[PDB]
Amino acid sequence: GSSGSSGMESYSQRQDHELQALEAIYGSDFQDLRPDARGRVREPPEINLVLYPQGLAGEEVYVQVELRVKCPPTYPDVVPEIDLKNAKGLSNESVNLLKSHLEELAKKQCGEVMIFELAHHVQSFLSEHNKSGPSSG
């Protein structure tokens, strides 16, 4: 089996598919950063995702980092890059750990879109690295 029409999408389509879904999910924890215009060369879909330790919510919080991602021009056929900027709590300390963890999780997730998993895994990790903090909300 496995025969059918020429499904002929492109990597930037598969990519921007995830982007549109992120704009719903987050709204403004998301920013796209693209220099893209209609009628231009393709370039990396650079985005920013603010991510936090679950529970405390959009409130005081302790640790956080922004997730910066560009994608290669072939993602998800290969793994994306991952960079963790403007960290709080983590003085570029366990940032290294999580970045390295994500840099492996990406290989496991390779074959389809992984950004949504990566963002979940960060919010696990941050909540892990977070200690003390009541709940309210």
Swiss-Prot record:
Homodimer; homodimerization is important for kinase activation by uncharged tRNAs. Interacts with GCN1; this interaction stimulates EIF2AK4/GCN2 kinase activity and is impaired by IMPACT upon a variety of stress conditions, such as amino acid depletion, UV-C irradiation, proteasome inhibitor treatment and glucose deprivation. Interacts with DNAJC3; this interaction inhibits EIF2AK4/GCN2 kinase activity during endoplasmic reticulum (ER), hypothermic and amino acid-starving stress conditions. Interacts with MAP3K20; activates EIF2AK4/GCN2 kinase activity in response to moderate ribotoxic stress. Residues 17-129 form the RWD domain. It is found in: Cytoplasm. It comes from Mus musculus (Mouse). The histidyl-tRNA synthetase-like region and protein kinase domains are necessary for eIF-2-alpha kinase activity and eIF-2-alpha-mediated translational control. The histidyl-tRNA synthetase-like domain is necessary for binding to uncharged tRNAs. Kinase domain 1 is a degenerate kinase domain. Disruption phenotype: Mice are viable, fertile, and exhibit no phenotypic abnormalities under standard growth conditions. Show an increase in prenatal and neonatal mortalities when essential amino acids are absent in the maternal diet during gestation. In response to nutrient deprivation, display reduced abilities to chronically down-regulate hepatic protein synthesis, resulting in preservation of liver mass relative to body size and enhanced skeletal muscle loss. Metabolic-stress sensing protein kinase that phosphorylates the alpha subunit of eukaryotic translation initiation factor 2 (EIF2S1/eIF-2-alpha) in response to low amino acid availability. Plays a role as an activator of the integrated stress response (ISR) required for adaptation to amino acid starvation. This is eIF-2-alpha kinase GCN2. It comes from the Eukaryota. Belongs to the protein kinase superfamily. Ser/Thr protein kinase family. GCN2 subfamily. The lineage of its organism: Eukaryota, Metazoa, Chordata, Craniata, Vertebrata. Expressed in liver. Expressed predominantly in the hippocampal CA1 region and the dentate gyrus, and to a lesser degree in CA3 (at protein level). Expressed in liver, lung, brain, kidney, skeletal muscle and testis. Expressed weakly in heart and spleen. Expressed in the hippocampal CA1 and CA3 regions, the dentate gyrus and cerebellum. Isoform 1 is widely expressed. Isoform 1 is expressed in brain, liver, skeletal muscle and testis. Isoform 3 is expressed in lung, brain, testis, prostate and choroid plexus. Isoform 4 is expressed in muscle, lung, kidney, brain, testis and prostate.
